[PDB]
Design a protein around this ligand. Sequence first.
Ligand SMILES: *[C@@H]1O[C@H](CO)[C@@H](O[C@@H]2O[C@H](CO)[C@@H](O)[C@H](O)[C@H]2NC(C)=O)[C@H](O)[C@H]1NC(C)=O
Ligand SMILES: *[C@@H]1O[C@H](CO)[C@@H](O[C@@H]2O[C@H](CO)[C@@H](O)[C@H](O)[C@H]2NC(C)=O)[C@H](O)[C@H]1NC(C)=O
Ligand SMILES: *[C@@H]1O[C@H](CO)[C@@H](O[C@@H]2O[C@H](CO)[C@@H](O)[C@H](O)[C@H]2NC(C)=O)[C@H](O)[C@H]1NC(C)=O
Ligand SMILES: *[C@@H]1O[C@H](CO)[C@@H](O[C@@H]2O[C@H](CO)[C@@H](O)[C@H](O)[C@H]2NC(C)=O)[C@H](O)[C@H]1NC(C)=O
Ligand SMILES: *[C@@H]1O[C@H](CO)[C@@H](O[C@@H]2O[C@H](CO)[C@@H](O)[C@H](O)[C@H]2NC(C)=O)[C@H](O)[C@H]1NC(C)=O
Ligand SMILES: *[C@@H]1O[C@H](CO)[C@@H](O[C@@H]2O[C@H](CO)[C@@H](O)[C@H](O)[C@H]2NC(C)=O)[C@H](O)[C@H]1NC(C)=O
Ligand SMILES: O[C@@H]1[C@@H](O)[C@@H](O)O[C@H](CO[C@H]2OC[C@@H](O)[C@H](O)[C@H]2O)[C@H]1O
Ligand SMILES: O[C@@H]1[C@@H](O)[C@@H](O)O[C@H](CO[C@H]2OC[C@@H](O)[C@H](O)[C@H]2O)[C@H]1O
Ligand SMILES: O[C@@H]1[C@@H](O)[C@H](O)O[C@H](CO[C@H]2OC[C@@H](O)[C@H](O)[C@H]2O)[C@H]1O
Ligand SMILES: O[C@@H]1[C@@H](O)[C@H](O)O[C@H](CO[C@H]2OC[C@@H](O)[C@H](O)[C@H]2O)[C@H]1O
Ligand SMILES: O[C@@H]1[C@@H](O)[C@H](O)O[C@H](CO[C@H]2OC[C@@H](O)[C@H](O)[C@H]2O)[C@H]1O
Ligand SMILES: O[C@@H]1[C@@H](O)[C@H](O)O[C@H](CO[C@H]2OC[C@@H](O)[C@H](O)[C@H]2O)[C@H]1O
Ligand SMILES: *[C@@H]1O[C@H](CO)[C@@H](O)[C@H](O)[C@H]1NC(C)=O
Ligand SMILES: *[C@@H]1O[C@H](CO)[C@@H](O)[C@H](O)[C@H]1NC(C)=O
Ligand SMILES: *[C@@H]1O[C@H](CO)[C@@H](O)[C@H](O)[C@H]1NC(C)=O
Ligand SMILES: *[C@@H]1O[C@H](CO)[C@@H](O)[C@H](O)[C@H]1NC(C)=O
Ligand SMILES: *[C@@H]1O[C@H](CO)[C@@H](O)[C@H](O)[C@H]1NC(C)=O
Ligand SMILES: *[C@@H]1O[C@H](CO)[C@@H](O)[C@H](O)[C@H]1NC(C)=O
Ligand SMILES: *[C@@H]1O[C@H](CO)[C@@H](O)[C@H](O)[C@H]1NC(C)=O
Ligand SMILES: *[C@@H]1O[C@H](CO)[C@@H](O)[C@H](O)[C@H]1NC(C)=O
Ligand SMILES: *[C@@H]1O[C@H](CO)[C@@H](O)[C@H](O)[C@H]1NC(C)=O
Ligand SMILES: OC[C@H]1O[C@@H](O)[C@H](O)[C@@H](O)[C@@H]1O
Ligand SMILES: [Ca+2]
Ligand SMILES: [Ca+2]
Lengths: 754, 754
Amino acid sequence: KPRYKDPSVPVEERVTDLLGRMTLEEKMSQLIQGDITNWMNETTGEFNLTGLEWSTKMRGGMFYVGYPVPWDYIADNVKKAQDYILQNTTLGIPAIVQTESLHGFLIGNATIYNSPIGFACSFNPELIEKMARLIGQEASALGVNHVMGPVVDLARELRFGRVEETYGEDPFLAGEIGYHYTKGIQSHNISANVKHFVGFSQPEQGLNTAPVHGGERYLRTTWLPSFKRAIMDAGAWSIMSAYHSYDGIPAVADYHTLTEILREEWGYKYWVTSDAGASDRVCTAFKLCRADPIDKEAVTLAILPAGNDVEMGGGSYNFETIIDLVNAGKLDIEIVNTAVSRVLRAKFEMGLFENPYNAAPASEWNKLIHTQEAVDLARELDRESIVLLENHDNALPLKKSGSIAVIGPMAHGFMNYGDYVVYESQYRGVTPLDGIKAAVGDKATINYAQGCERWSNDQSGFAEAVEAAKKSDVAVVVVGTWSRDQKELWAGLNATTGEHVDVNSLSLVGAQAPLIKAIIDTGVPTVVVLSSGKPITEPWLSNNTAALVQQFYPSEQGGNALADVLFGDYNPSGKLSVSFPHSVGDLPIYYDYLNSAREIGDAGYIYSNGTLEFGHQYALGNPKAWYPFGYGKSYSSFEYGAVKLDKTNVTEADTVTVSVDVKNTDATREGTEVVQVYVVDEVASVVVPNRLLKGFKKVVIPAGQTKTVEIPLKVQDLGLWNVRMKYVVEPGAFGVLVGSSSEDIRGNATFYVQ
Amino acid sequence: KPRYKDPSVPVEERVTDLLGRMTLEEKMSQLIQGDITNWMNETTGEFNLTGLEWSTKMRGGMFYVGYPVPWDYIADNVKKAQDYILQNTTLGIPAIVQTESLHGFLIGNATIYNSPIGFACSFNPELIEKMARLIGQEASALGVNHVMGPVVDLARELRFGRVEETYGEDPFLAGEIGYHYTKGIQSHNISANVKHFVGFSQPEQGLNTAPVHGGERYLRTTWLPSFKRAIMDAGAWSIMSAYHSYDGIPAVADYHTLTEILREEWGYKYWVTSDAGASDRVCTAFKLCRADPIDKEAVTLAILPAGNDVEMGGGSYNFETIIDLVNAGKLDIEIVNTAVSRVLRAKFEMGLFENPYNAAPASEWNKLIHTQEAVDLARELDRESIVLLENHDNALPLKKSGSIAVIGPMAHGFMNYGDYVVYESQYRGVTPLDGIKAAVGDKATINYAQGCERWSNDQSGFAEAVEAAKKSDVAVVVVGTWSRDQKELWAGLNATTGEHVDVNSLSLVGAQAPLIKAIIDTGVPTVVVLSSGKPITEPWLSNNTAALVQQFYPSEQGGNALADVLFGDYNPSGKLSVSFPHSVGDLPIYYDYLNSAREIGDAGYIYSNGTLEFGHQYALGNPKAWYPFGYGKSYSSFEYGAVKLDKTNVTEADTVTVSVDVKNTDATREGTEVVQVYVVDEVASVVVPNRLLKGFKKVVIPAGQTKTVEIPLKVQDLGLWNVRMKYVVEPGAFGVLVGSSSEDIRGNATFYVQ
Ligand SMILES: *[C@@H]1O[C@H](CO)[C@@H](O[C@@H]2O[C@H](CO)[C@@H](O)[C@H](O)[C@H]2NC(C)=O)[C@H](O)[C@H]1NC(C)=O
Ligand SMILES: *[C@@H]1O[C@H](CO)[C@@H](O[C@@H]2O[C@H](CO)[C@@H](O)[C@H](O)[C@H]2NC(C)=O)[C@H](O)[C@H]1NC(C)=O
Ligand SMILES: *[C@@H]1O[C@H](CO)[C@@H](O[C@@H]2O[C@H](CO)[C@@H](O)[C@H](O)[C@H]2NC(C)=O)[C@H](O)[C@H]1NC(C)=O
Ligand SMILES: *[C@@H]1O[C@H](CO)[C@@H](O[C@@H]2O[C@H](CO)[C@@H](O)[C@H](O)[C@H]2NC(C)=O)[C@H](O)[C@H]1NC(C)=O
Ligand SMILES: *[C@@H]1O[C@H](CO)[C@@H](O[C@@H]2O[C@H](CO)[C@@H](O)[C@H](O)[C@H]2NC(C)=O)[C@H](O)[C@H]1NC(C)=O
Ligand SMILES: *[C@@H]1O[C@H](CO)[C@@H](O[C@@H]2O[C@H](CO)[C@@H](O)[C@H](O)[C@H]2NC(C)=O)[C@H](O)[C@H]1NC(C)=O
Ligand SMILES: O[C@@H]1[C@@H](O)[C@@H](O)O[C@H](CO[C@H]2OC[C@@H](O)[C@H](O)[C@H]2O)[C@H]1O
Ligand SMILES: O[C@@H]1[C@@H](O)[C@@H](O)O[C@H](CO[C@H]2OC[C@@H](O)[C@H](O)[C@H]2O)[C@H]1O
Ligand SMILES: O[C@@H]1[C@@H](O)[C@H](O)O[C@H](CO[C@H]2OC[C@@H](O)[C@H](O)[C@H]2O)[C@H]1O
Ligand SMILES: O[C@@H]1[C@@H](O)[C@H](O)O[C@H](CO[C@H]2OC[C@@H](O)[C@H](O)[C@H]2O)[C@H]1O
Ligand SMILES: O[C@@H]1[C@@H](O)[C@H](O)O[C@H](CO[C@H]2OC[C@@H](O)[C@H](O)[C@H]2O)[C@H]1O
Ligand SMILES: O[C@@H]1[C@@H](O)[C@H](O)O[C@H](CO[C@H]2OC[C@@H](O)[C@H](O)[C@H]2O)[C@H]1O
Ligand SMILES: *[C@@H]1O[C@H](CO)[C@@H](O)[C@H](O)[C@H]1NC(C)=O
Ligand SMILES: *[C@@H]1O[C@H](CO)[C@@H](O)[C@H](O)[C@H]1NC(C)=O
Ligand SMILES: *[C@@H]1O[C@H](CO)[C@@H](O)[C@H](O)[C@H]1NC(C)=O
Ligand SMILES: *[C@@H]1O[C@H](CO)[C@@H](O)[C@H](O)[C@H]1NC(C)=O
Ligand SMILES: *[C@@H]1O[C@H](CO)[C@@H](O)[C@H](O)[C@H]1NC(C)=O
Ligand SMILES: *[C@@H]1O[C@H](CO)[C@@H](O)[C@H](O)[C@H]1NC(C)=O
Ligand SMILES: *[C@@H]1O[C@H](CO)[C@@H](O)[C@H](O)[C@H]1NC(C)=O
Ligand SMILES: *[C@@H]1O[C@H](CO)[C@@H](O)[C@H](O)[C@H]1NC(C)=O
Ligand SMILES: *[C@@H]1O[C@H](CO)[C@@H](O)[C@H](O)[C@H]1NC(C)=O
Ligand SMILES: OC[C@H]1O[C@@H](O)[C@H](O)[C@@H](O)[C@@H]1O
Ligand SMILES: [Ca+2]
Ligand SMILES: [Ca+2]
């Protein structure tokens, strides 16, 4: 009876015991990612035993299963791989089984939630946790025990294609959502995988994987906090390192971040994997070794001792030279032993040695995957993510009567999903047109016209659209950006957002802006719905439409959720997770800019009648956000009382509770507000962000009633990185600005740290 | 009599002697900038004795004289200040007498050279040195002994209003020009003033004085090298610190840069002044101390011990609290003593204690200022800075015969000077129209038409322009950007470039692009001249005009210089000092991007007929330069032979000389080429720039002849900053790429470092 098999023995002693029974070859095998296709034929489902035996021996620690196949192909062949480990290897080390989960378990006919940038707008981390739990349920059903999420990168570069995959631009919010997500996944003993460590998503020129300029204080002030919450506090069992270099040091090879910060400072106990092909990039993109033939040893010497424990597939599998480098004396066995230990500790605490078989039987899959609870939750969360940008003279909510024109490329014909959905997902789900027809039934006339193709400047289709609008009491125009599923994205089909789809303009592409202009000119009240993955720059829309609504890439219930809002069954509650600029010329546009930024001189202006009004910052434009972070209106209005602090004179050990009474001045309907708390460190030893979101609360306030909102601020989380790169909460004054948005402040107070 | 007065005693013992006799009140007075208007009425020229006595006492180390007044107001009131120091103070410490010299001595009716971004295109640093020498002549004639330049900031953020004030985007070329300029000035015992230390010109959003994101490897690799050549090798007697923060440490308050790098590592012997009001900014913009009432003590404690010796005017004169900080035990007298020493040491090296009186007599000023030598040099340097972008079917050079149309707002009416020009300068100089009339005389008919105003979308004038085109054999259209003189810029008049004039678009403002199209559509061969202070994004110009010419902001001879190129008396030789992007959405665009940047995937495209070809980087745009760094054409073609290296296997200590034979293949005419040499560090320990200019040579090659060019590369200048932030020249291969531009490479070789 070997000690590592005994669950009453403590985790460290189990790891120590298993580690001393392993050959170097078996150690290597834990640190190299395999793939299910090594033994599963992707088109037929046929099983290659030889392929299984080799993959287990050479790269058996964990394997990827994200292919667009039927459910049984994954379940049967995961099961066969775990049967084989258990009965046909000496040590029986269970496999970690990897897929994508970003806004849904990446398999055909599982539940699709709205894209991350969108559900960040909900400001509802409890509901996001519920989502992660149901995602975990769907994945666990087929034998998966690891998911490659959450993404805790920040949307600080709007031209970048993966903005949609983030939880917005603010460290705190992305931190809270990442924590709740990770916790909901790990409730099912499924490993999360926090990505992409660290500083990834401010690439130069906005281009996918390009390097990032920045210093250490910005890394520690802005980029790392969202990793810290998911890692230390939610106990994430795995981390993915990134494709970029940060101030010239590749993320996959950065000792300072991967070892000094992650292990020494934060106490991280588990493993880091490279991104896909990111090992090879060390020679091929960064030029830190010879690319042809690729210097496998150099790759390994750069990334394993830095702290990147596991090499992912998609590269040249450079970690096969581990054995050679250990025998040459060039790599100490302890470095390997530490990486292996990190992988095994994860597996013990996940419970994999006790229950390695995860999958439910074939007959239960339909009762675990795409359940009503999950569908309903997708509608609920999507509905709570929609942001009302504008609403003039009670144009919304619409009446369920009269005639309604439904116009635009995004209104029907295809579901406008974000990236990280499976092939052909776009052919199911509730479109905006579907949603509107089902909301009105027989009580109103719906006049549908496509208007234009999203990918064309052709205006052929405008006459049909204009006619639709002119014979209607109101017009809804659905436009935006679009992405592609995992097959069509990498086959090169046209898109405006997603991984490896970066833009040099945030204006509506093609015929979409003229389409809107054609409908407005009819004089019919025109509501624009932006259906998209990131900000869109059309400032003229604000005051030239009846109303303007933002639904970031929808869920499979997108159209029901949109109509819930359009017709008033749900009073819209979303707040912006990311700031909207006036133009791509104005970037970056994040609300948390350091003091001495943004607010400098006078802005100029180009009028639509042709007049130029010259200014300075800028000569003919405006560096201020068109819409700031945390902006969002309601059909109700909210009145804030005096802000009240439970403590005024405090120590860095204390918690200052922010209190404020919020009244719903709407007599007829219940309304939801997101009370936001911004902390300002008034006087500092180094330059700090002008303001920071440090707490918030989403509250449902009955018509005419008042609710008391309490938001805790832990003083220890409000510090800075001083000139010696030490974290300190300096004695002095801290402003507390409480509001409806990052600019829309309704009250303030001040506490004093001693 | 005292040892500090003795020119045989060495400088360090002179400084010691003088310092030991000074009161604390006298030491303060050295470190606070005065102003000549403290005793000279700007309007009348009347003398305030009281004012002089107060200024000398409290702020008499140095004073500013950059006011738009007559020559005698500066000369007489400078002399009265130096007379008063000698005769009526105890110690007789002569004043440093400060003005602006950026592209000309800043006083009415002096010689105006073309803007720095322009003269960097000459790639002719010996000629720039002559310019700096004549500039020193004009300044010295009126008693000035210090000039606030060169600008060694890099043009890395094209939205920033001060691109025109830099020598382009490249560290090497800015370092060479800065050195030569610094030497030309100091040849007259006029102190140079290397600005703006350090990392100023990549402000967030491009806004004036906004903070900069970057790490220390970027600072060391890219920003510091231009400072280093001017400071360490040219022996610059002063430095000015900047308005910005770099990774959240204010430039004015950065011990690491101002002291550890600048003194401990570079051995810099002299003094640093703040920028204008930059002291106050520690509290007011950066919020590192109370702003109202401003914490003078805290400002002083932040900047003086960091290594910023001297406080400029334009703030609250916070250094007046030095005396109080010393009395309270909070500031060590030795900090003050070192700052003063630095100022006094500079004064001794300048020879000021031996010759306090600079000025020439009133009767000689017309023989020292605006001489034919300076004026002619202005034309020569300007014509050498013009860059030929396109020239289809030998449209250029033009014939001095037939009819010529001269069109556009910048062709006549005003001179399109850059910033750092004095009030009403724009009403003198040679316009493009002036120069074109003088070139042809009566041999050609010249048909003028303004076309449009630069500041208006009004197209009233287009008929007149079209008409002028239709009755000419060829058309010249001069459009671009504009700036303002020192009064008009700061009184808020309209502009597209200049200090505090930043832009969110690089497209032609107003009617200028439709003006061009109107003239083109007429069928008449159209030559476009771009007259501007930064890149302009109009890709369609390249293949829809007969020729395309860049003239960055001209000298007072700009029209002649332009005419000299257009009609072929001078064969154009300019090469770009900065890269031209396709759009403002494509930024940044510098040629020296780190490996893994710029060249990532396929680019999309928007056809003029509306068709959309979707790509990836970007969906509908191109991140590649429209015109790269070092691009420039000739009326001749150049054929490059084999690149040879005098040494192949070398050490850190050696110098590798590059050699190549270049043939002018034009039978009829002499041609100038700028052979440029790029180094590639092929395999590195950290991520380095993809290629860097490390050498060039401008060569005049006769018709049909071949000329051997030799460019030296010192190996110790080709290193990087490794993972421990040490400078090292790592053993291995270095590629040598020899070319007509940073893209257009014609030959190569490799040497190896052992
Ligand atoms: C079953 O799996 C093995 C892989 O383990 C396959 O064998 C490989 O065949 C390819 C041919 O392209 C060779 O390049 C490799 O060197 C082989 N590797 C090994 C380890 O055998 C085999 O082709 C698979 N068979 C089927 C029918 O799918
Ligand atoms: C997650 O994994 C842990 C580890 O296997 C599970 O906790 C154990 O459950 C058994 C009962 O089957 C208990 O006797 C042990 O005391 C528990 N161990 C620890 C360390 O807590 C847990 O049940 C699994 N959770 C889920 C949701 O499957
Ligand atoms: C953008 O993508 C769509 C595919 O979603 C392209 O449309 C198809 O084009 C082919 C012709 O090449 C037709 O046979 C298909 O029937 C079209 N499908 C649809 C749904 O229209 C579209 O042409 C692409 N556009 C651009 C500009 O690349
Ligand atoms: C001559 O210079 C002195 C400066 O020493 C001027 O005196 C100042 O007068 C103004 C009145 O507007 C006050 O704000 C200052 O506080 C005074 N300063 C001092 C130190 O006395 C004097 O007014 C000047 N006279 C002129 C130009 O005619
Ligand atoms: C620049 O200043 C230096 C220092 O005052 C001048 O050099 C001195 O000139 C005297 C006679 O005129 C010589 O006898 C000394 O040997 C020189 N001293 C040093 C230290 O060089 C120099 O002439 C000045 N240059 C100009 C152009 O005015
Ligand atoms: C840009 O500035 C110019 C001056 O260079 C303005 O033109 C002047 O306008 C005033 C009227 O306000 C007149 O008194 C002058 O006669 C005008 N000068 C010229 C040369 O025409 C111009 O209006 C400004 N434009 C904008 C849009 O601000
Ligand atoms: O429909 C509601 C109104 O009943 C009222 O409560 O104000 C809400 C917000 O409207 C303001 O902000 C958005 C802008 O578009 C409006 O002009 C402004 O009144 C609204 O939603
Ligand atoms: O007019 C001269 C010609 O004598 C010849 O030598 O080529 C020169 C360079 O021309 C090329 O580059 C610029 C493009 O505009 C041309 O079409 C291309 O042939 C030219 O200036
Ligand atoms: O057996 C399951 C079904 O119960 C479930 O509802 O659909 C799954 C996915 O299969 C369809 O969509 C994706 C493609 O891979 C298949 O070809 C489709 O039939 C089934 O596996
Ligand atoms: O978020 C990461 C991406 O950065 C990256 O491009 O793809 C990853 C998924 O990689 C899988 O697919 C490709 C295979 O080669 C790998 O082995 C897989 O793990 C994302 O999670
Ligand atoms: O006397 C000199 C002239 O010799 C010189 O050529 O011009 C100088 C500047 O004079 C004009 O420009 C600046 C303004 O302040 C003056 O009032 C102008 O006349 C003269 O000082
Ligand atoms: O290049 C610097 C600029 O950054 C700054 O804005 O102005 C300086 C000139 O300062 C003079 O003008 C204003 C006065 O208050 C100062 O005392 C002067 O030295 C430029 O050199
Ligand atoms: C899967 O099976 C089919 C033939 O039955 C074949 O076309 C395909 O290449 C197979 N793939 C592998 C890896 O064996
Ligand atoms: C695994 O081991 C068992 C013996 O316990 C055997 O029955 C089975 O066939 C083996 N399978 C493989 C694939 O080696
Ligand atoms: C729309 O009008 C409102 C009120 O007049 C104004 O505050 C807002 O700035 C305008 N928005 C835009 C984008 O012009
Ligand atoms: C254009 O709009 C602005 C609005 O105030 C105004 O100054 C100007 O007179 C208008 N111009 C024309 C041509 O109507
Ligand atoms: C906070 O402390 C200051 C210390 O001077 C005191 O004036 C003030 O009364 C305190 N406030 C409260 C609410 O106790
Ligand atoms: C200069 O003198 C005039 C009148 O002689 C006076 O009105 C003006 O204020 C003075 N200027 C300054 C700046 O003192
Ligand atoms: C300066 O000194 C001399 C005495 O050498 C005296 O004649 C003159 O009046 C003094 N000037 C002033 C302004 O005090
Ligand atoms: C102009 O045409 C040339 C020659 O075909 C081509 O290489 C170049 O890319 C074109 N430039 C632009 C900006 O269209
Ligand atoms: C637009 O130009 C492109 C040039 O390749 C061509 O393919 C396309 O057919 C043109 N447009 C139309 C409507 O024919
Ligand atoms: O080239 C690398 C890329 O190739 C694609 O096939 C994968 O799906 C991506 O996730 C991967 O990063
Ligand atoms: Ca503070
Ligand atoms: Ca090397």
